[PDB]
Amino acid sequence: AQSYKDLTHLPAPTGKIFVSVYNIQDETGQFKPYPASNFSTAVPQSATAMLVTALKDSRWFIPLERQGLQNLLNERKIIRAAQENGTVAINNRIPLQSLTAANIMVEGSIIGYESNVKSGGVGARYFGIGADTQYQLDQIAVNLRVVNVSTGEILSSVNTSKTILSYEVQAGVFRFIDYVGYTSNEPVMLCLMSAIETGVIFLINDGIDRGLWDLQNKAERQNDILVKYRHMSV
Amino acid sequence: PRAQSYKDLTHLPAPTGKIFVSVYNIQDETGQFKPYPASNFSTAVPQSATAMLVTALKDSRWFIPLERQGLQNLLNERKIIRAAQENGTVAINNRIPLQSLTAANIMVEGSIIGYESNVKSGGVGARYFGIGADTQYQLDQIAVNLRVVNVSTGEILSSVNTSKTILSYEVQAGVFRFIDYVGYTSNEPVMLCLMSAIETGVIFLINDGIDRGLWDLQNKAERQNDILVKYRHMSV
Amino acid sequence: AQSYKDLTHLPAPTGKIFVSVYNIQDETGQFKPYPASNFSTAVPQSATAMLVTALKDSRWFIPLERQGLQNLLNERKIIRAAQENGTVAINNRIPLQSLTAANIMVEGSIIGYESNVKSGGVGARYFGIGADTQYQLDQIAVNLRVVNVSTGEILSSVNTSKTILSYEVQAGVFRFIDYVGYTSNEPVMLCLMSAIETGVIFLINDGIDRGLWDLQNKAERQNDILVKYRHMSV
Amino acid sequence: RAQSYKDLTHLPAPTGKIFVSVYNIQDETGQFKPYPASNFSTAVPQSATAMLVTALKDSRWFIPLERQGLQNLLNERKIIRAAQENGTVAINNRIPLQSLTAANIMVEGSIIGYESNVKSGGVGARYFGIGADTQYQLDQIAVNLRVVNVSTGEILSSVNTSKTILSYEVQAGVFRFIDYVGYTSNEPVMLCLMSAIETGVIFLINDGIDRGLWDLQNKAERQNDILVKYRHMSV
Amino acid sequence: RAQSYKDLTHLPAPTGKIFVSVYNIQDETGQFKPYPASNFSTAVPQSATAMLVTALKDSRWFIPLERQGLQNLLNERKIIRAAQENGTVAINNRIPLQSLTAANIMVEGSIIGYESNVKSGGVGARYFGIGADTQYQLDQIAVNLRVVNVSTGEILSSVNTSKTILSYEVQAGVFRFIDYQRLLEGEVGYTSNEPVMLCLMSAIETGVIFLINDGIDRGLWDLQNKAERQNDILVKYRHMS
Amino acid sequence: RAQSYKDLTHLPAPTGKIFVSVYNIQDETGQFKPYPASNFSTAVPQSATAMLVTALKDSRWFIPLERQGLQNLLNERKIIRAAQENGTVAINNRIPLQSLTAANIMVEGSIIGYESNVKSGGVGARYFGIGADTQYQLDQIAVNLRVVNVSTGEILSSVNTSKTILSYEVQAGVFRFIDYVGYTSNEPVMLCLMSAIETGVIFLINDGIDRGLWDLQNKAERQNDILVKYRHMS
Amino acid sequence: RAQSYKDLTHLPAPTGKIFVSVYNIQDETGQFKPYPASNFSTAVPQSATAMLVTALKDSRWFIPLERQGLQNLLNERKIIRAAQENGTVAINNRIPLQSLTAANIMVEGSIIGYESNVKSGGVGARYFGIGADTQYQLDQIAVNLRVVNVSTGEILSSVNTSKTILSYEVQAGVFRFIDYQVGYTSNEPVMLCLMSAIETGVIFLINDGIDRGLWDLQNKAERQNDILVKYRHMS
Amino acid sequence: PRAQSYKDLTHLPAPTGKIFVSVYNIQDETGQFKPYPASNFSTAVPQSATAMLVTALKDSRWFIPLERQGLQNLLNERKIIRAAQENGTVAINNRIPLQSLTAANIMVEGSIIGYESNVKSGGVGARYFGIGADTQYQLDQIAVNLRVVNVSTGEILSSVNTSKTILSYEVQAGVFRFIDYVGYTSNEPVMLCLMSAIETGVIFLINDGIDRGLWDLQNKAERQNDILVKYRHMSV
């Protein structure tokens, strides 16, 4: 997808930013219609994992684990129990630091989702397909927030929407366009990822502008990708 | 392009100074879900009013929202910070100075108190949309209540109510025509509805606060600002 | 609507009354029938929000927030922590009083709800529509109680029933009859709201008669609205 | 208003009114409404407790103490005390606290059974006066009320009432009914629940007379028309 | 009123009424009503404990002690103590507290089975004297009552009852019924109560009589007149076991 | 009464009855009834535990100690002690407390399987001697009973029983049945559960005898008619 | 009884029986039965843990220690201690308490997958010997058994078994079956599947343990036993 | 036969020494269940990913997995042991020497992040499977995410994502022909998909770790290994 390429070729910052990752909540309230199970969610429930990946892939952030904090704490208990008596095989000693802290924490909401099946119309032209074949429209809105831990104020809050027309051309292969491409992943997931990745870039952009963080070369503020995504926020 | 509610909200007259306000949840108190063939669990209304409100309070240029949903998370992070620096070994460039959590005298809270949606044909919609009297458009109505509570006393200072009614139909794949009891939107209508209501509520809120002396304008004359009188009139 | 106009034009009391607002529980047990979701409630779940609005709008009461008492308390902790060390910017100082108390607390129940689709009969006659055209009947019963915090005894206990025949004439506009007028609100919404509004007035009347609270002008005990709602209460 | 209400509100007086604590009346019918109702729609309103509290008051025999929101009460009292302990509160805003009113008996109960069927013609049709094609409704609710001695925990009384109501709609939202003749604007099942609880309160008062828990002001009134009406009902 | 009630209300007297703690009778049938009922509609009423208490009282053998609402009781007693500890309460309003009454036995139970099917013709049609195409109902309930020794935790008594009732509606809200345990005797009764409830109640009332008999036979409690062990009702119910 | 019941109530006597604590028999079939039953109707009764207690009592080999309501018991004993500590209790109402009777063996169990199929013609039709289009049902239950040594926690015995019952209704509420012909007034699936549990208790008794967990009064009677009958069944 | 049970009950003996604490076997298939079953009817019986315990005993290799109901155990022991601490209990009623027996190993597991579909013809029709239009049933279950070292928390052994059973009914409640690599059973097929799988897992476990020196055979020569080598090859 | 992923996983080059890793759950975060006529409660994907991961980590010969799911059970058993020998009376042949629970510097965790399943006919399936264009095969797609966390600092060291797509159809009862974007399988296709994704996940993880200097190979000659290069190309 284009978002992944843009995300992976940003200009570099002075240094990577520590950030603690809390959840991206699904707040659409939406599930699939008949004949799905009543319990089948309309959107994957994996936004947080995607965010962690998107933050790392940006080359701008060091994500700190918080979802499984209790597990972390246990493991550290077990380490301490294994070395407090000074008998542990030295090749097996694990030096413990204090957990890395962060001044900002990142959180989010999937704020909306719409999906409908369509045929012909504008989609059929851009795809180069028959005016009777049925395609899909998937739209997701994501909100990402960065909170200041020192004060509890919101440092940054971007909103992204991605809308994707798609249709199956081969078993398990989809052609799609971002309001032209090939994808092997489900359209709805491509949408969720693309929205989250874009959100991270929006995030990085907003932070540069507000002096939360700066680029290695301030000259690189006018990088093609950065202005591309800066303009997607009007 | 973007709704009238957003435009009005983002061009309000300024307050003497921005007001800190703590935001807790906006509950969906409609009791409503989508009918067959929806999943029984599909909510009629989006479940993200709180995020929308935080964004709208910020966008008004009147408020600095303090997020409280993850207060418990915030507090843990501060524990983790203190534990990392109490021994004075942390790399000086990685030191995180802690202030006190910013406090607020007022707390804003709310409810989505009503929602109705039905599909319609002909009538006023058909005329204003300029469509066939057999062609179907949709009506979405959402009602929101916003309350301001005094943290020092616990008195409920303000309690405003807004209703937004939106007529819509899809004209192109993923594009909707709408009327606010004509515009175009790329967003699903029930969300356009909820957003407009929340944004309107924040404006109603600001007005009520001025009138009750909860907060004051920078320019005392601008009590007769076009936007403020517009929304003042929607409340009578 | 009539209830609202009347509620906002009550004669004034000697002084506004503090009251703690606790929930109005939905005790109908009722949800919407096919094709609604099984989980769709028959009645909105916002009676309490409406009570607070009605109490303030009566200009008789000062409602004290209790649903978010725990949040309140937290904010007060945060306030104290921010100023106990005396370093806070003097203009950023927030003086804390004790939470305002109340001798009475108001609570309630939605004790019954009926909703049915109908044709012909009285509706058709008064609405002036075909005996084949369909209207809705919505009926709600509400109970409001005022409790003495000092003794735990019930100070006042009023009951209201609102019955509304309605039908849609235009997209989103209903003509209704109160067992003719026009409303933009959903009928069940208007029914619940009207019952609660009427309830507060019933409450206020009962309170006057039982000496729980007094009017500035005792002569206005014969106010048009007050006697109107006194007549309904029998 | 129904006969039950009339009777309840015209009982002979007791020596002095009785404090009684009311905790919830549980729906123990296990019953919900059939298709096309939501699976979650209860057959019977979930508001019996509120109704009982009202009925206890209306009888003029009892002063009901509500306990459902006891924890809220307690909080309010915390807030009151915190507000005046430092003696700075304006004397006009001072709230004098008494001790919460206590009671020796606790009343509790269950809705123990419910049946509803749609009927056509038959016997009802005659007292209603219509053809074997019009459909009327039968609603039957059974309630149990218990009185508990708080001092000892003995269950002093356990009465049972059944109300059966035949009804059918004549006008939109207006019902004709017969109590195994009147008109009601209230939904029949709710008229039934209410009539059951009201009747129960009277069964309770009678049973208390008979067990020496309380007696009448005027001993002659021990064989009052209403009290005797409902005693015969209870056997 | 059912025969079970008549019999329960005319048992011979004991030396003294027996204190008993009443805990719940659990519905362990696992059964709900079929389409078109709500999935949540229970096949059997959920009110056996309320009925048990009434049956224990109506027997004139027991004094039931409240335990379902034990926590509420305790609260009320707190409130009481708080109201008179400062010695200012109006003397007419003073409430003397004893210790909660104890009991050496607790009674508990299970509804262990429930069967219901609609039938036509057959033996029912004969004994009811109705058309072989008219529909009647069969309801069967099984109840288990246990008496537990609180001093030792041993189970003192565990009786089992089944009541089977054929019924059909004859008038609006009036049912004619038969008690399969007397089917061939051809006696038919009328009831205003729903059949599954008459069934539940009749089983529970029978269980208590079974219970009183077992206790008599095992010396858990005694009759005033030892001679009255040969009372008609006691041998009637002694034989059903 | 069932063959199982006759056999259980006429076993050879043990040297003396055995105290055993009874904890639950869990329904571990995972099975509920099909359409048009309620989704919530269990396939099998939920009263196996009460049945076991009755069966253990009825064997004349065990004295079951009630543990399901252990917490209630303990409460009752608090209440007794509170009523007598002050030495004021009415002498005829005095309750002497012993210690709760203890037991060295715990009995517990699982219903591990259930099958129900309604059938037509075939072998059933022959043994019943009915029309070959008339429909009968097959019910099969598998039960597991375990005895645990409380001193050590070792599992002393683990027996498994399967009962399969063919039945069809011949009179209203009366069933003819066969255990791979008899009459029962009880529902076939209950007869199935009960019979399995009764057989289980006998199995248990045999295994205990064989392993020296407990002994019979006359050691020669190991060759009792009933004991060998059920011994051969496994 | 099936090939798995005969085999489990005729294994070569170990040096001595092994204590193992049994915690649950979780159903991790996520699977329930389709229409017209109740939505809540599980595809697979929920009794794997009871079955494992039975299998472990039946192997004559293990002594299972009950842990599912450990708190009940603990309560009963409290009651015993309470009954004899005051030295008055009748000596014949005295219960000597040891410490709960411990174990160096802990056995745990998961049912990790399940399939069921109905079929016609193919290998089944041949091994069953019926026409290619007559229908048989396929049930397949995958189980994972783990043995964990309590001293270190490392996983000591981890076997995986899949059993596939083709089946169809010939008489009411009697089935023809095949252990897809012919037999009779009175039990439901998915039952025989789970049980055969759990029994196979225990043998796989015993084998893996011998090979890794977790436990030893009486006679190391018996390493080439017919049953043991049979199960070595299926792994 | 057995999937290529398994074959590749079990023939990796050895690391300098095997690495202890603690494994907590792999959550199903697809939100997906089976459609009618399945039970509403039937999950689309097996709920046994964690067992499968533990199995995969062992099989790679790079890791020693420490299961933590029953940590509480473990701890209880150790209590029981200690209580059983603290009085020094236990039978010597039954004596159990307790070490400390083995610790690990890294902790592995993961999510099933996506799942789609469809029944299909004709197209590529009919061609490669060699079946009638009306004959039905199924498509299963699963996406897995594995994360490695530093237990000493809480930094998330690695987060790899894998997708497996499998076309399949049953050819004989309980035997499937399948294609991994022809082979035969006795196991169910959705399980084959989940297993293959997880195995691939582990190799991706090993690769990422080499790259980030978390670990290196025993034999320097093996730095450019065919299997390691194969699976790097699937990521890029």
UniProtKB/Swiss-Prot annotation, chains A, C:
GO biological process: curli assembly; protein secretion by the type VIII secretion system; protein transmembrane transport; single-species biofilm formation
InterPro entries per record: Curli_assmbl/transp-comp_CsgG
Domain of life: Bacteria
Keywords: Cell membrane, Lipoprotein, Membrane, Palmitate, Signal
Subcellular location: Cell membrane
Membrane topology, from the record: Lipid-anchor
GO MF annotation list: identical protein binding
Pfam families reported in the protein's UniProt record: CsgG
GO CC entries: cell outer membrane; curli secretion complex; outer membrane-bounded periplasmic space; plasma membrane
Family: Belongs to the CsgG family.
Function: May be involved in the biogenesis of curli organelles.
Descriptive protein name: Curli production assembly/transport component CsgG
Protein species of origin: Escherichia coli (strain K12)
From Swiss-Prot, chains B, H:
GO molecular function: identical protein binding
Domain of life: Bacteria
Matches recorded under InterPro entries: Curli_assmbl/transp-comp_CsgG
Topology relative to the membrane: Lipid-anchor
GO terms, biological process: curli assembly; protein secretion by the type VIII secretion system; protein transmembrane transport; single-species biofilm formation
Gene3D superfamilies membership: ABC-type transport auxiliary lipoprotein component
GO cellular component: cell outer membrane; curli secretion complex; outer membrane-bounded periplasmic space; plasma membrane
Membrane spanning stretches: none
Predominant location: membrane
Alphabetically ordered keywords of this record: Cell membrane, Lipoprotein, Membrane, Palmitate, Signal
PROSITE patterns associated with the record: PROKAR_LIPOPROTEIN (PS51257)
Keyword Zinc: no
Family named by the database record: Belongs to the CsgG family.
Function description: May be involved in the biogenesis of curli organelles.
Designated name of the protein: Curli production assembly/transport component CsgG
From Swiss-Prot, chain E:
Species assigned in the record: Escherichia coli (strain K12)
Main location as per UniProt: membrane
Membrane topology: Lipid-anchor
Pfam families hit by this protein: CsgG
Summary of the function given for this chain in its UniProt record: May be involved in the biogenesis of curli organelles.
GO molecular function, one term: identical protein binding
Family (UniProt): Belongs to the CsgG family.
GO CC annotation: cell outer membrane; curli secretion complex; outer membrane-bounded periplasmic space; plasma membrane
Entry protein name: Curli production assembly/transport component CsgG
Transmembrane domains' residue ranges: none
Gene, per the UniProt record: csgG
Annotated compartments: Cell membrane
InterPro entries: Curli_assmbl/transp-comp_CsgG
UniProt entry keywords in alphabetical sequence: Cell membrane, Lipoprotein, Membrane, Palmitate, Signal
Gene Ontology terms describing biological process: curli assembly; protein secretion by the type VIII secretion system; protein transmembrane transport; single-species biofilm formation
